[PDB]
Amino acid sequence: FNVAHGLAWSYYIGYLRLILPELQARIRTYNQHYNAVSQRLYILLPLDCGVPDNLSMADPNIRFLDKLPQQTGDKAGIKDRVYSNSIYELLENGQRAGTCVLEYATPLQTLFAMSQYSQAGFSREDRLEQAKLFCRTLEDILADAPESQNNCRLIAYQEPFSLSQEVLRHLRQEEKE
Amino acid sequence: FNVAHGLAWSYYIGYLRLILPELQARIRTYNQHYNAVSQRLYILLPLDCGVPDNLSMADPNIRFLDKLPQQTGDKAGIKDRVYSNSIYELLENGQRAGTCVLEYATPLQTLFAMSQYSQAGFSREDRLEQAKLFCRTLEDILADAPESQNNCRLIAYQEPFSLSQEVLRHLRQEEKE
Numbered sequence A, B: 001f002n003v004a005h006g007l008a009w010s011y012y013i014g015y016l017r018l019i020l021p022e023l024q025a026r027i028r029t030y031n032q033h034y035n036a037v038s039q040r041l042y043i044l045l046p047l048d049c050g051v052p053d054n055l056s057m058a059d060p061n062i063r064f065l066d067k068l069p070q071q072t073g074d075k076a077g078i079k080d081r082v083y084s085n086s087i088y089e090l091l092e093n094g095q096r097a098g099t100c101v102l103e104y105a106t107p108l109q110t111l112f113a114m115s116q117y118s119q120a121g122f123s124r125e126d127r128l129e130q131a132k133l134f135c136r137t138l139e140d141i142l143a144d145a146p147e148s149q150n151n152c153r154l155i156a157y158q159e160p161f162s163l164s165q166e167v168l169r170h171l172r173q174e175e176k177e
């Protein structure tokens, strides 16, 4: 029916509510320790199309550089379950034009897969509007979450382009203020 | 409305479909390498109550021993995202009566949390039947999944007891055949 609403709240309480409070603290460690990546976490949400696993192939201008400090903790009986993220370099005309923490909204690929299996009661036409609904309920969550306080920026998009440009646009404008 | 159905399918396509095919292979590595833990993955699903993060406190007789070999791979733009599980010793009258890979159905604690936040449209009364629905749709998935082929056993339960006994019951009976 409306699976996206539930998955958005799962994205909050099982991930971002966990890693947002300590995110900025762990970026400082990397930058301070390494000779710079900006503070926010940038989450890609392709609405129409699917979610690749390697951004470098989704857009060659998005080159991955290094990892962050891992985040560990016991969650649901697994001692030292570790949450890790990735830092990507974004190029423009062969020039390093940005650096930041970039990743896809993993639940989006769950939706894409569920629209294939039969007994999920989820048709391939509903896919777009569910991706839209997911992108939006998550927006409502982050505006009034105490954990989200200039922590992350949603990058929604739909493709009939170049992704590296789309993320650059969000980077360039958060530096404006 | 009916959030559990969606979360069950998220549990399959984002976790068990990933780690079940290689699970048994990675258990052999541990046992063969370490001087024994049985092959299945045992997933706890408390329906009424919540999901603690440390089983040793949920039941003192469930003592954690060691970890498995980590499982890594790129998923949604995070290079070398790692999935790890935990191996627990289960005691009986102060005696080591079992060893296996044990964990909670993480989505269950997502449900428990969502029943608190206001704008999730999810009341605290619906909690039990949603946990029931989650336990069941997942059963339907594992019966006809090609990835699940004597890989894991669901341990559902509801508490007005001793958990270590409940898991032992499932261990003792899978050894009967």
Ligand SMILES: Nc1nc(=O)c2ncn([C@@H]3O[C@@H]4COP(=O)(O)O[C@H]5[C@@H](O)[C@H](n6cnc7c(N)ncnc76)O[C@@H]5COP(=O)(O)O[C@@H]3[C@@H]4O)c2[nH]1
Residues within 6 Å of the ligand: A010, A011, A013, A014, A015, A078, A081, A082, A083, A084, A103, A104, A106, A107, A110, B010, B011, B014, B015, B076, B078, B081, B082, B083, B084, B105, B106, B107, B110
């Ligand atoms: N991008 C990203 N990186 C992460 O490290 C990460 N960890 C969680 N999540 C996303 O947040 C939510 C996690 O909630 P939960 O863990 O309760 O459900 C998860 C979780 O129960 C199960 N799962 C995934 N990894 C593990 C794990 N290491 N241990 C147990 N369960 C896991 O599979 C469900 C769906 O995961 P994803 O569908 O890949 O995206 C998850 C999910 O939407 C992550 N997203």
